[PDB]
Amino acid sequence: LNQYKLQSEIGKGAYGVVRLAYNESEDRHYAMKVLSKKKLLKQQLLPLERVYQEIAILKKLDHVNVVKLIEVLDDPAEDNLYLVFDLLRKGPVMEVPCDKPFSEEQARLYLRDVILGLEYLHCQKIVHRDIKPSNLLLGDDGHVKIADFGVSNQFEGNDAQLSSTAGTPAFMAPEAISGQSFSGKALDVWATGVTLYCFVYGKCPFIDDFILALHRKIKNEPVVFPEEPEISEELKDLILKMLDKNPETRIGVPDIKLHPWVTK
Numbered sequence: 001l002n003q004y005k006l007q008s009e010i011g012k013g014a015y016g017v018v019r020l021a022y023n024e025s026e027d028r029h030y031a032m033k034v035l036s037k038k039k040l041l042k043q044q045l046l047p048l049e050r051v052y053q054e055i056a057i058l059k060k061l062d063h064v065n066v067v068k069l070i071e072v073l074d075d076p077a078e079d080n081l082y083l084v085f086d087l088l089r090k091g092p093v094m095e096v097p098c099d100k101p102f103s104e105e106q107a108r109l110y111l112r113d114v115i116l117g118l119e120y121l122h123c124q125k126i127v128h129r130d131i132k133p134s135n136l137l138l139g140d141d142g143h144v145k146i147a148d149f150g151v152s153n154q155f156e157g158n159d160a161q162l163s164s165t166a167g168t169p170a171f172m173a174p175e176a177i178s179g180q181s182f183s184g185k186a187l188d189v190w191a192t193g194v195t196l197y198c199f200v201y202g203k204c205p206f207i208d209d210f211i212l213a214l215h216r217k218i219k220n221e222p223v224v225f226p227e228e229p230e231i232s233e234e235l236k237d238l239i240l241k242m243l244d245k246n247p248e249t250r251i252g253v254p255d256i257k258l259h260p261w262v263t264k
């Protein structure tokens with residue numbers, strides 16, 4: 001739309017692409033997500049319907065640990081739909097794999113951010129469904145914000161009752177990979193455990209190039225802390241509680257906030 005110059009591509013989420021966008025008059029840069037309606041059709045909730053579900057979520061979001069939607073340039077004549085967010089120019093906090101992970105204490109501060117954001121979203125009746133390091137954007141204030149609401153869902157009552165899979169394989173909980181329907185909240189906690197694991201190790205806890213072997217490692221193998229880097233027994237204990245294969249016993253968000261690794 002009139003007031004923005006679209007510059008280079010900066011990231012690519014689940015749908016569309018994100019481009020750096022300059023407001024020439026305002027002397028100010030933004031993150032613009034661009035969706036092509038022709039491209040959407042090729043990828044019972046239809047596309048274009050699914051986009052406006054996302055937009056409905058995005059408009060509610062008002063938390064320091066979640067991204068902020070500014071406006072929607074949305075001309076029915078044009079093919080493109082444009083979603084304008086505030087820019088966090090540093091981008092994702094981490095891309096996995098990577099050789100240099102964060103210290104345990106830097107990881108703790110990033111987990112607090114992600115938990116506070118998740119709590120907000122859960123309080124607001126949203127589940128994210130694709131929490132991973134590459135969807136956590138680093139602010140200039142040192143805090144991460146949760147991005148990419150492409151597979152996220154609104155729900156009623158205590159929890160989202162979900163049938164199908166969505167988001168990234170490596171961060172899907174055992175119960176989601178089928179038959180019976182499962183907790184939204186619990187799937188978000190599992191992904192955040194895998195995220196916490198990535199923060200301190202730089203690699204996922206279950207790794208395989210073939211998806212069937214990944215599924216079995218997720219469903220059956222235990223979490224394995226390598227000897228190096230060394231982390232604390234208190235952190236290991238939180239990770240095992242978050243990567244608990246049974247969603248009934250798995251630690252919920254309110255008790256993660258009271259875990260001694262989180263608080264001290």
Ligand SMILES: O=C(O)c1ccc(-c2c[nH]c3ncc(-c4ccccc4)cc23)cc1C1CCCC1
Nearest residue numbers: 010011012013031085086087088091147148149
């Ligand atoms: O696809 C999405 O749903 C989506 C929507 C908005 C943003 C965003 C809002 N502010 C932002 N500031 C900065 C950046 C950014 C900067 C540098 C590198 C990558 C991303 C991205 C954003 C990001 C995304 C995804 C793209 C990849 C990361 C998640």
Ligand SMILES: [Cl-]
Nearest residue numbers: 096097203204
């Ligand atoms: Cl990995």
